[PDB]
Scaffold this motif. Structure first.
Motif, PDB file in Angstrom:
ATOM      1  N   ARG A 204     -46.041 -23.079  25.300  1.00  0.00           N
ATOM      2  CA  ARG A 204     -46.239 -23.443  26.708  1.00  0.00           C
ATOM      3  C   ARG A 204     -45.923 -22.212  27.576  1.00  0.00           C
ATOM      4  O   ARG A 204     -45.226 -21.300  27.116  1.00  0.00           O
ATOM      5  CB  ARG A 204     -45.338 -24.620  27.127  1.00  0.00           C
ATOM      6  N   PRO A 205     -46.420 -22.193  28.832  1.00  0.00           N
ATOM      7  CA  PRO A 205     -46.185 -21.057  29.722  1.00  0.00           C
ATOM      8  C   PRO A 205     -44.882 -21.217  30.534  1.00  0.00           C
ATOM      9  O   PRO A 205     -44.917 -21.442  31.757  1.00  0.00           O
ATOM     10  CB  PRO A 205     -47.422 -21.093  30.621  1.00  0.00           C
ATOM     11  N   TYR A 206     -43.743 -21.083  29.851  1.00  0.00           N
ATOM     12  CA  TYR A 206     -42.432 -21.355  30.456  1.00  0.00           C
ATOM     13  C   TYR A 206     -42.094 -20.322  31.538  1.00  0.00           C
ATOM     14  O   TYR A 206     -42.328 -19.118  31.344  1.00  0.00           O
ATOM     15  CB  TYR A 206     -41.299 -21.362  29.402  1.00  0.00           C
ATOM     16  N   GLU A 207     -41.542 -20.793  32.669  1.00  0.00           N
ATOM     17  CA  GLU A 207     -41.189 -19.871  33.747  1.00  0.00           C
ATOM     18  C   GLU A 207     -39.809 -19.221  33.583  1.00  0.00           C
ATOM     19  O   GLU A 207     -39.573 -18.155  34.128  1.00  0.00           O
ATOM     20  CB  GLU A 207     -41.440 -20.446  35.158  1.00  0.00           C
TER      21      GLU A 207
ATOM     22  N   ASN B 261     -43.137 -26.974  34.574  1.00  0.00           N
ATOM     23  CA  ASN B 261     -43.552 -28.101  35.427  1.00  0.00           C
ATOM     24  C   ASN B 261     -42.394 -29.045  35.775  1.00  0.00           C
ATOM     25  O   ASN B 261     -42.524 -30.269  35.711  1.00  0.00           O
ATOM     26  CB  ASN B 261     -44.752 -28.860  34.804  1.00  0.00           C
ATOM     27  N   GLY B 262     -41.258 -28.460  36.151  1.00  0.00           N
ATOM     28  CA  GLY B 262     -40.086 -29.231  36.562  1.00  0.00           C
ATOM     29  C   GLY B 262     -39.343 -29.977  35.458  1.00  0.00           C
ATOM     30  O   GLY B 262     -38.540 -30.862  35.763  1.00  0.00           O
ATOM     31  N   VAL B 263     -39.596 -29.613  34.193  1.00  0.00           N
ATOM     32  CA  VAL B 263     -38.940 -30.224  33.043  1.00  0.00           C
ATOM     33  C   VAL B 263     -38.425 -29.125  32.121  1.00  0.00           C
ATOM     34  O   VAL B 263     -39.154 -28.183  31.805  1.00  0.00           O
ATOM     35  CB  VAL B 263     -39.912 -31.146  32.275  1.00  0.00           C
TER      36      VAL B 263
ATOM     37  N   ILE C 185     -35.251 -33.706  30.766  1.00  0.00           N
ATOM     38  CA  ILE C 185     -35.305 -32.909  29.532  1.00  0.00           C
ATOM     39  C   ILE C 185     -36.228 -33.579  28.511  1.00  0.00           C
ATOM     40  O   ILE C 185     -36.409 -34.798  28.541  1.00  0.00           O
ATOM     41  CB  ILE C 185     -33.903 -32.702  28.895  1.00  0.00           C
ATOM     42  N   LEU C 186     -36.825 -32.768  27.635  1.00  0.00           N
ATOM     43  CA  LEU C 186     -37.644 -33.237  26.518  1.00  0.00           C
ATOM     44  C   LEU C 186     -37.403 -32.310  25.333  1.00  0.00           C
ATOM     45  O   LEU C 186     -36.979 -31.187  25.528  1.00  0.00           O
ATOM     46  CB  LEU C 186     -39.118 -33.229  26.891  1.00  0.00           C
ATOM     47  N   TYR C 187     -37.682 -32.774  24.121  1.00  0.00           N
ATOM     48  CA  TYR C 187     -37.323 -32.053  22.896  1.00  0.00           C
ATOM     49  C   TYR C 187     -38.551 -31.789  22.006  1.00  0.00           C
ATOM     50  O   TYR C 187     -39.280 -32.732  21.680  1.00  0.00           O
ATOM     51  CB  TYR C 187     -36.294 -32.883  22.085  1.00  0.00           C
TER      52      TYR C 187
END
Length: 406
Positions: free
Chosen positions: A241-244, A267-269, A354-356
């Motif tokens: 993913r394109p993490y900031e 995206n805020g997560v 949060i997600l895993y």
């Protein structure tokens, strides 16, 4: 606009009130109930009206918490009703003046058994406890004993723990024996909240924490801690993913397991991208600070260094923190309060903050075995059984340090 219950807190102590004979008042219940501000304001009102040139006490879990929760907003309210307040920041007390009368308000923390000893030589006309149920019983006894002046009253403010807790059994269940009033608050007693806002707060909590912090009930902690964890909702595929932004979070162990978790914003997560897990007991070979420093660099090889914002580590790994700063790696001290961290991790799951990734497999095994200590609960302590918790302690440091502020 004040509710009927709020107005009762403001007026109970006046000559006209039938309950002004009482030695004190307890307010418990939910969050965001509007009880803390009226309780602290009524305490000051009462004291300025009934005494002059006297000392009063105000205590929280820490002084920092008391100032953040009570004193800062209390000062704003006192100024608007024409009370004059001199804050002695370094000395931790306030001089308050009103209609030609002057009294002094000393600030305290209550953390443990040592807390009772901290001040035994002051003399007081009153005592106010914010978050009393997080304080040691020893401190509450010491401070009550210093209330020797005639006409002194005791004021207690808290949210619920479990029903074997010392404050529930010794105070709330012995009201008439101690000659105290009791009022219980929920969000319906706070008139400044719309039905849409109340429902948003309700959705932060499920299970035991919903029962305590929304319904205002003193219920026992039992069994699986994170019983809201749900593999249909919280687990996602392991794909780029394109993490900031990134952080790493660590639970340091030499004779126990060390763990790292890589966290990425998108995206805020915040996503737990992957996990590191070294058991030195099972491998029959323990590891040094140097070796863990090396493994950490391998663990973050493939990320843009301008996005990596540092390692979150517990202050007890002081030797490791020294080596990291020596090598130019940024370090953030973990906010490690256990019961708060657990509550906030649950809220993060409930709101999907949060997600895993599905590669975090040791983390998932721990989610299904991490439990409350039943014996401690029956003695009035809320504590996890310290097993199957090495990934989860690190996840807790991340959630409590980065996602939650004040």
């Amino acid at each position: 606009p004040f509710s009927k219950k709020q107005l009762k807190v403001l007026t109970w102590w006046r000559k006209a009130s039938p309950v002004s004979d009482k030695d004190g008042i307890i307010c418990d219940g939910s969050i965001r109930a509007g009880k803390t501000i009226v309780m602290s304001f009524s305490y000051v009102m009462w004291a300025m009206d009934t005494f002059n040139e006297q000392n009063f006490g105000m205590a929280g879990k820490t002084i920092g918490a008391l100032r953040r929760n009570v004193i800062t907003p209390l000062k704003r309210m006192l100024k608007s009703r024409g009370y004059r307040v001199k804050d002695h920041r370094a000395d931790n007390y306030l001089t308050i003046t009103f209609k030609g009368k002057t009294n002094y308000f000393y600030l305290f923390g209550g953390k443990d058994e040592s807390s009772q000893d901290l001040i035994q030589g002051i003399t007081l006309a009153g005592m106010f406890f914010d978050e009393v149920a997080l304080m040691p019983e020893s401190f509450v006894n010491q401070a009550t004993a210093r209330c020797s002046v005639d006409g002194a009253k005791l004021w207690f403010n808290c949210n619920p723990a479990g029903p074997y807790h010392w404050f529930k059994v010794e105070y709330l269940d012995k009201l008439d024996e101690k000659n105290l009033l009791h009022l219980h608050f929920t969000m319906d007693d706070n008139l400044s909240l719309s039905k849409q806002v109340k429902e948003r707060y309700q959705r932060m909590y499920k299970g035991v924490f919903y029962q305590r912090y929304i319904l205002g009930l003193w219920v026992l902690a039992e069994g699986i801690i994170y019983d809201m964890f749900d593999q249909d909702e919280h687990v996602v595929p392991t794909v780029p993913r394109p993490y900031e932004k990134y952080y790493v979070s660590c639970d340091y162990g030499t004779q126990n397991p060390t763990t790292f978790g890589l966290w990425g914003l998108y995206n805020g997560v915040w996503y737990k991208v992957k996990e590191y897990h070294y058991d030195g007991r099972k491998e029959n070979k323990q590891k040094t600070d140097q070796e863990y420093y090396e493994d950490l660099m391998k663990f973050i090889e493939d990320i843009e260094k301008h996005k990596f914002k540092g390692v979150i580590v517990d202050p007890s790994a002081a030797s490791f923190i020294a080596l990291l700063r020596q090598k130019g790696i940024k370090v953030i001290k973990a906010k490690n309060d256990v019961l708060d961290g657990i509550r906030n991790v649950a809220t993060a799951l409930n709101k999907k903050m949060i997600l895993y990734n599905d590669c975090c497999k040791e983390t998932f095994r721990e989610y299904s075995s991490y439990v409350w200590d039943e014996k401690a609960a029956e003695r009035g302590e809320d504590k996890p059984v310290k097993q199957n918790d090495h990934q989860l302690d690190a996840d807790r440091y991340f959630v409590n340090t980065i996602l939650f502020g004040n």
